[PDB]
Point group: D2
Chain length 115, copies 4
């Protein structure tokens, strides 16, 4: 996955209906304020979401929600754990927990359309 | 903004409560499927959202929603237009329309906490 | 008419392709412990307009909806939910619904349906 | 008790710090045109558990909520909304609420409040 590679993300776990993607907040991932850009954290969660959902077959994202809990500084190590919440014939929903230093720093919820 | 720069995003419009950010889907923005990664489109919308909201003062994102309408191929030119929906003393909400070839390809809705 | 809509006293004020306006009043049985309009009532109002607007394109079922609350509403307030189409695809569609009262935007609803 | 909750026949089954369980039955006045539980009723149920769970930490007001629908529910179905705390910060808090009936997950609600 080109975008994952460009952001330095690595797949740490993969299994039917689940996936864990990890990354570090690099200098090129910061916002003008000096903390991890919301787009980087979302990209991380979205990547785990994409991998987990696709273990069930071709699927395209329809709607996703991202809830931010704590700002992250440069160098922060982050892991996104995707878990299957619902699996229907035409759609599926996943929860992705973004964790750093053993605490939940963001929560992602997404639904895909199964091709 | 480091992340914006790293993704090749440019600010095309900026004004009180609004902003337009543009970008092109590069080779490093594609997913394993060959289309624009959901994280890239979100990063674009989130950047416009961040710029528009901060014209009102320091603000941090709390919750954001991204609705995807059409897959984008490599080279697609995309623009994210942020508009202020609500401005309260402690929070504010923005709508960000992601457009390509004159059509809405994604819709972003986000709320910030005003510092 | 829709049973739940009727029970809540909601009326369809306008309905056209891709759009709908539903109106209601915050009644005593729509209040929360605080004495203001319950979040569920405002959502029910928005959801009703959403359902009507989306159905103009053919049968559909709601998949995901977001409700953003901006202002509290008091008992007796007359409120409207104005739904407009944001996107119409072959298998899904998305709508924006503004909840307004006395010219003020009370809440914003965003929803996507799966087209049957 | 909460007026809107009462009007919908909802009962508080469990309440502890950061969590709550609200129960109800899909009544005739909770149905949509299709004859299934109206999306607004299921949201009202989830929102009620959300409000109760969040209030255990002190006064708060809902800011943004998401409702994801998975299965339709028929008239007469007994349903529960189970709220759990996902995050508690100084100014905001977030909860996950599962709507379940007959052991099946009917919907998923995610909500964030602003702490007063
Ligand atoms: Cl959402
Ligand atoms: Mg009644």
């Amino acid at each position: 996955d080109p975008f994952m590679e460009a952001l330095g993300l690595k797949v740490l776990h993969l299994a039917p209906g689940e996936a864990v993607v990890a990354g570090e907040v690099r200098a090129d991932h910061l916002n003008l304020h000096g903390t991890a850009h919301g787009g980087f954290l979302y990209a991380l969660a979205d990547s785990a979401f994409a991998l987990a959902s696709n273990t069930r077959g071709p699927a395209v994202a329809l709607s996703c929600r991202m809830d931010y809990f704590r700002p992250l500084g440069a160098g922060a190590r982050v892991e996104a754990r995707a878990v299957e919440v619902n699996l229907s014939r035409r759609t599926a929903t996943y929860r992705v927990e973004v964790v750093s230093e053993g605490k939940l720093v963001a929560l992602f919820t997404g639904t895909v359309f199964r091709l």
